[PDB]
């Protein structure tokens, strides 16, 4: 006939505060973890470029979480440019308007929402490969 039984286990599954709020774990970054303020990036228009999968979905929840505004396009309003791999549009925008936005990696954004306050972008600048 039928007969069975269950037991106790300890598996890992998303729920509350899972994985560190680091890029390496962006797709599994609990943006809701960041105790940062809901106005972290008050009236801060940032331009997301590169991301697509969850990484982006995050920044979206982050920026918004911090009050920031996630622009679909680039412009002179852009106060920051969170790059993940490379920002092409940036080039175009540069060929359009004359401005120098802060190009950094989500990592920064995180740290910001991690420290609760905005941090330096210089220590989080996104440059190309090679050095010389």
Swiss-Prot record:
Transmembrane residue ranges: none
Post-translational modification: Phosphorylated on serine and threonine residues in response to X-ray irradiation. Ubiquitinated and degraded by the proteasome. X-ray irradiation reduces ubiquitination. Deubiquitinated by USP13; leading to TOPBP1 stabilizion and activation of the ATR-TOPBP1 axis pathway.
Subunit structure: Interacts (via BRCT domains 1 and 2) with (phosphorylated) MDC1; promoting TOPBP1 recruitment to DNA damage sites during mitosis. Interacts (via BRCT domains 7 and 8) with (autophosphorylated) ATR; promoting activation of ATR. Interacts (via BRCT domains 7 and 8) with (phosphorylated) POLQ; specifically binds POLQ phosphorylated by PLK1, promoting POLQ recruitment to DNA damage sites. Interacts (via BRCT domains 1 and 2) with (phosphorylated) RAD9A. Interacts (via BRCT domain 2) with (phosphorylated) TP53BP1. Interacts (via BRCT domain 2) with (phosphorylated) HTATSF1.
Lineage: Eukaryota, Metazoa, Chordata, Craniata, Vertebrata
Domain of life, source organism: Eukaryota
Record protein name field: DNA topoisomerase 2-binding protein 1
Function: Scaffold protein that acts as a key protein-protein adapter in DNA replication and DNA repair. Composed of multiple BRCT domains, which specifically recognize and bind phosphorylated proteins, bringing proteins together into functional combinations. Required for DNA replication initiation but not for the formation of pre-replicative complexes or the elongation stages. Necessary for the loading of replication factors onto chromatin, including GMNC, CDC45, DNA polymerases and components of the GINS complex.
UniProt record similarity statement: Belongs to the TOPBP1 family.
UniProt remark on domains: Some BRCT domains specifically recognize and bind phosphoserine/phosphothreonine marks on proteins. BRCT domains 1 and 2 bind phosphorylated MDC1 and RAD9A. BRCT domain 2 binds phosphorylated HTATSF1 and TP53BP1. BRCT domains 7 and 8 bind phosphorylated ATR, POLQ and RAD51.
Domain BRCT: start-end pairs: 36-126
Tissue: Highly expressed in heart, brain, placenta, lung and kidney.
Subcellular location: Nucleus; Chromosome; Cytoplasm, Cytoskeleton, Microtubule organizing center, Centrosome; Cytoplasm, Cytoskeleton, Spindle pole
Induction entry: Up-regulated during the S phase of the cell cycle. Up-regulated by E2F1 and interferon.
